[PDB]
Design a protein around this ligand. Sequence first.
Ligand code: NA
Lengths: 419, 364
Amino acid sequence: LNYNLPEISKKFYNLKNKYSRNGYGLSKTEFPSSIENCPSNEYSIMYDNKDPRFLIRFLLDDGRYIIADRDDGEVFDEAPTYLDNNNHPIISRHYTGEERQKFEQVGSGDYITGEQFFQFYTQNKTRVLSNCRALDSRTILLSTAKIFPIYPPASETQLTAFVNSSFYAAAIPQLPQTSLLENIPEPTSLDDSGVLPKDAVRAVKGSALLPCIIVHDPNLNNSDKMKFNTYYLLEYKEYWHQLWSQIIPAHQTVKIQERTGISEVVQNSMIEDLNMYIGADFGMLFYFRSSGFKEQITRGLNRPLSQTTTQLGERVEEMEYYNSNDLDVRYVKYALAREFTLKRVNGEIVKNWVAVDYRLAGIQSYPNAPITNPLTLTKHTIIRCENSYDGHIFKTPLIFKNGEVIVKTNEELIPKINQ
Amino acid sequence: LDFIDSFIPTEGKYIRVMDFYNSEYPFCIHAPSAPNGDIMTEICSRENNQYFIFFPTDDGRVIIANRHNGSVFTGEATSVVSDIYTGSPLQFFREVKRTMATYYLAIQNPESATDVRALEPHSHELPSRLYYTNNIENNSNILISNKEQIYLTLPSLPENEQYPKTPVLSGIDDIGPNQSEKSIIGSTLIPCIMVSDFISLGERMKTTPYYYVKHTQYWQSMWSALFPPGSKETKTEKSGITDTSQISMTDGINVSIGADFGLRFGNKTFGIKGGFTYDTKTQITNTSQLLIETTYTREYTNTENFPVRYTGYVLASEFTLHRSDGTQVNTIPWVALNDNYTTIARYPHFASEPLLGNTKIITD
Ligand code: NA
């Protein structure tokens, strides 16, 4: 598969100045600035011809970039503080996802003769990143609102011209092959309890590359994480999650509780680790830290953005089923599980999150068809649910044919819908 | 049969009939027969004026077109009107699901992303326009239900292939194929309202509401010659895209090619640039400069001590616009040549790669 990352999002590039004659560029040097009115400190992004930085550009949904450093894992930040001539200093800072950490790259120049370069703009191209005063001297990087047109050529523009030089490869995990969802597993005897979730056959349906800056992995420092796990792998899988398994005596009606959805604990876990969680429509919801990448992520996962603000919770329902057979029958019901797995580049599993989709479910039995008659749902009651996004029950009686997937929205419900 | 499909109907693309949930009388949302006019609630009549298709965009928002003439929901001063799609911010709506069965339509002020209003009628007993309201929380007068849901039959899209292979020469006299075998890199779906065609918008909505753009790559022959031992020859090579081709694609699918070989999206297709590039495995341009046609001259030297057949190939990307029946729309080729990716087919195969000399641009 292909997540379709740009070349600059797959490499830590050394950014050199286009017009520098002595190989000056963005640096991590510990020496202070040599220019008079260009003060430096520990947070300053330096400019020097030694100790070069290697920077990756994470692509946001809107096209702008996050600039992160390979060694300390911090990102470029436009500080709100004012310098001389009302300029903002560019500093190193932990990723927050604020607007001050977003930069727009604009290419210009002679593309035909390969003499092109690029600049970085902020605040809707009202400010451009520029060296402080010097081209071939140790100085700092800043944001200035003093933008000149490229024609007629201004000397001050040269302080803003960047090119790509040497690079390190970003650590990128391979995407798994997609597979098809199996048929609902059949019991082989009256004593067969069916297939538990731990043994259920998974089908890969999607995968996404997550920048390490949005992933919370406390087992690694930010340096190792940025360099060895630049992108985490989030794979989306599906399997048949068993709701219950029971022998139902001949001509008997039994009460069975069906627990689906997802617990608040699991939701909070995914929120803490990825700032993502599941909506009541089983679509993806995002918080501030990772919201900037939600469109790329969902296109890779093949799971839609949620269209509701309601958070998916646990769903406890009590169902009554009738066995219309002249014999005791082993019945087992499965519902569709939606599984998300966070992996490192090496393949190690960081965490799992599963939501059980009650809207897609089915029943199998032993003895199987055509020996036995299909089970019948005769009563449906919602016992516990903390939201009313779906307060509908099935219109009973409803027949669950063996192996058939019952889609809740394709059946008659109470209260009535689509009518 | 051994596989199960997990695709749920409501998460796909379909035609819908809309009515307001609180309405007792059988009123449906009704688009005017004229291209321009007020959106109204009228008695449900099974007319194409009451059948709508929501075209999803990158950020989840939708473009709401009717099945009669293809005009879309257009937000104005105090109410919503029907008008021709232009890519205006006022023609993008969000479908917010309060429950599994009910939803409201929200539009946000392009002047402020905080000012969001929902659509609401001023009557349930009489025909009414769709007005704005700021009272959204616990207000059921904005809730809309789907009276009907008719699922579309999308065209069959081709499977993605890997990158095209460099042609292999059979002998010394073999100049090789003018083009290699075409490889399909990707394809993407595009709403009929964003393309140019001789079919009316209303008819497109009924028979081919979705078009699709195909992205194929292949090696294009530039030159071929039998190089004497130690011989230095000058060859002419082209790169980029012709003015005719740029104009045709721009008018065709509202997409242009930037000078960085990234895609420039116009007002119509800007809302789907994320999905377009992802499906076609392309990138959005970062420059404001357009790709043009350039003619180079490059010197090549055969360093071998024996005659060697050489043939120069340049990587080509072609885009084609197709209807739902698979027919190609554009009669003018939308092709871009990228000289950053060139390959030199050779006979004999073990011969070394030609030594590149000086490169000069032809200013005709
Ligand atoms: Na001094």
